[PDB]
């Protein structure tokens, strides 16, 4: 449960610092690669904290959650204060239905910050189950949203905490108003695609996730969430399309196969289903390049 | 439409 199921023939085993190589194919829009390069960074140097969040960081853009919570708690494990580690933690263990791991989380990503760290001094009606931990870093956070009225970090971190309790219709609000500050930022644009999504307008979700690609052309996740709405609208050629995108961009994948599996079925193709359980995306032919 | 988007 603890450490971190590396890859084995790491190409960077053999390369001297591999952490500037992977940091620019992350510049180079290619996650899959970046994750490896830092895996070796990793290995060769255990104690460097923002190698474990760089993975961290990364494998949750490439849709795998698994892997991104064991490698920032590592991170966290070298550097408890680091608050882009746990606003990371935040999201995944939030998509991964973590609920009292989540709150923790965000709580520790405020009250971390030094500006912020003045309201440590804390102290039927509204949503969750885990409801004190809830009703605190929701005061928690509006008090630090009275304090600096237009903090962009504050509120995506109010839509993730919506997401939690299912209130798309805050999350979005707040997402909103973090997109617009920060217009440029595809971390922030995915949030408002999967709030809007989870709240059932997929419609505009697909608007919010074109922009964040147009940002970063090579962000997986979000291939992936474009699959969920074209899924959830029956629109299932278009899911297909997407998701395979979605495969490729990733590299072997995951339950990613699964979902696959699930959109040939409802499409009665019997055929294709069969041939899954190859490696290869090679056959599947509408797109090309 | 039930499956779950991602942050």
Same mark, same amino acid.
């Given at each position: 449960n603890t450490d971190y199921p590396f890859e084995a023939?790491? #190409?960077?085993?053999?390369h001297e610092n591999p952490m500037e190589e992977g940091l620019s194919m992350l510049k180079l829009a290619n996650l899959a690669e970046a994750a490896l390069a830092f895996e070796a960074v990793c290995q060769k140097e255990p104690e460097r904290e923002e190698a474990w969040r760089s993975l961290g960081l990364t494998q949750a853009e490439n849709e795998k959650d698994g892997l991104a919570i064991i490698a920032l708690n %590592?991170? /966290?494990? =070298? *550097? #408890?204060?680091? +608050?882009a580690v746990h606003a990371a933690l935040a999201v995944? %263990? !939030?998509?991964? %239905?973590?609920?009292n791991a989540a709150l923790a989380s965000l709580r520790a990503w405020l009250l971390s910050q030094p500006q912020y760290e003045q309201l440590g001094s804390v102290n039927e009606d509204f949503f969750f189950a885990a409801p004190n931990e809830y009703r605190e870093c929701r005061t928690l956070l509006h008090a630090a949203l009275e304090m600096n009225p237009n903090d962009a970090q504050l509120h995506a971190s109010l839509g @993730? =905490?919506?997401?939690?309790?299912?209130?798309?219709?805050? $999350?979005?609000?707040?997402?909103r108003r973090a997109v617009e500050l920060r217009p440029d930022d595809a971390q922030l644009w995915n949030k408002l695609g999967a709030t809007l999504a989870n709240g059932n307008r997929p419609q505009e979700?697909? *608007?919010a996730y074109n922009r964040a690609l147009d940002i970063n052309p090579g962000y997986v996740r979000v291939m992936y969430n474009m699959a969920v709405?074209?899924?959830?609208?029956?629109?299932? *050629?278009?899911? $297909?399309?997407? =998701? @395979? /995108?979605? +495969?490729?961009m990733q590299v072997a994948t995951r339950s990613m196969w699964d979902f696959f599996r699930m959109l040939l079925n409802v499409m009665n193709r019997p055929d294709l289903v069969? =041939? !899954?359980?190859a490696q290869n995306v090679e056959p599947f032919a509408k797109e090309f390049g | 439409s039930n499956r779950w988007s991602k942050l």
């Open positions: 023939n790491n #190409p960077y085993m053999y %590592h991170a /966290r494990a =070298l *550097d #408890p204060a680091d +608050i995944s %263990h !939030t998509n991964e %239905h973590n609920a @993730v =905490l919506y997401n939690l309790s299912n209130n798309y219709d805050s $999350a979005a609000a707040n997402l979700a697909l *608007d709405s074209y899924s959830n609208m029956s629109q299932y *050629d278009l899911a $297909a399309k997407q =998701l @395979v /995108r979605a +495969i490729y069969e =041939l !899954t359980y | -």
